[PDB]
A = this chain, B = another copy of it.
Amino acid sequence: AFRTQKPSLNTVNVVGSSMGSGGVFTIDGKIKCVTAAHVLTGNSARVSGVGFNQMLDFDVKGDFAIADCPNWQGVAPKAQFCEDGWTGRAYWLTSSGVEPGVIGNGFAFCFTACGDSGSPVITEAGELVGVHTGSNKQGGGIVTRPSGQFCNVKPIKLSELSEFFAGPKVPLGDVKIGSHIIKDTCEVPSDLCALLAAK
C-alpha cells in the first residue's frame, strides 16, 4: 500500500531454510550483503537479484547476518552502521518493495509480512540500522542491529509514535490501531493516520 511496486536495485532475494530479503551496500570500502540469520540454512543462502545469483556465507551476531560479495557489479550504496541509540524514520528494503517505518527507543514500527525477514532497515540518510527480523502483523516490529541486540514488540504510546510523523492532527475515525499500541489519543498527525489507514 505504502510499499513501492518494485524493490530497490540493491535489494536481493535470500533463500536458505526459508525465503526472505537482504540488501547490498558499500561498508568500509567493501561490497557486503546483509540479511537475517534465521532465513539462512546454516550460515549459507542463495542470494539472487537482477544480474545476480550466488551462494554466500555470512558472519553472524544474533539474527544479524553479513557477508562479503565482491562479485556484485550493480550499485552498492555507501552505508555505515548508524550510531547505537539512533531513532527516526527509516526504510525497510524488502524483496517486494520499500516500506516506510519508524525506529524508536526500544521499538520498531512498520507494516511487514512473510518474505520480509532480512530486509535492511536504513535511515533517511542511508545509514544502516539493522535488518528486519519479524513482526506481530500489526506494525509492531522486531529489528536486529549488527551488534545482535534487537527490539521486541513492546507496548508503545500512540502519542510517542506520532512524534515521528508530520502533518496536522486529524481524527483517527474508524481506523483500527494495533493491540500493542497504547491508545492515549483519538487525534494523530495526518501522515500517521494515512499510514495506519493503509493497513
Contact = CB atoms under 8 A, between A and B. Distances in A.
A193 B9 CA distance: 13
Nearest to A5: B173
Q: Please tell me how many copies of the chain the complex holds.
A: 2
Contacts of A182: none
Interface in A74-99: 75, 77, 89, 91, 93, 97-98
A4 B197 contact: yes
B100 A168 contact: no
A7 B166 contact: no
A55 interface: no
Contacts of A169: 8-9, 75
Contacts of A8: 168-170, 190
Given A166-B124, A168-B77, A4 B97 contact: no
A197 B193 CA distance: 19
Counting contact residues on chain A (CB < 8 A from B), the size range is 35 or more
Given A91-B167, A93-B168, A168-B77, A98 B173 contact: no
B5 A168 contact: no
A9 B187 contact: yes
Contacts of A98: 167-168, 170, 190, 193-194
28 contacts: A2-B2, A2-B194, A3-B194, A4-B190, A4-B197, A5-B170, A5-B174, A5-B197, A6-B171, A6-B193, A8-B168, A8-B169, A8-B170, A8-B190, A9-B168, A9-B170, A9-B171, A9-B187, A91-B166, A91-B167, A91-B168, A91-B190, A93-B168, A97-B170, A98-B170, A98-B194, A100-B194, A124-B167
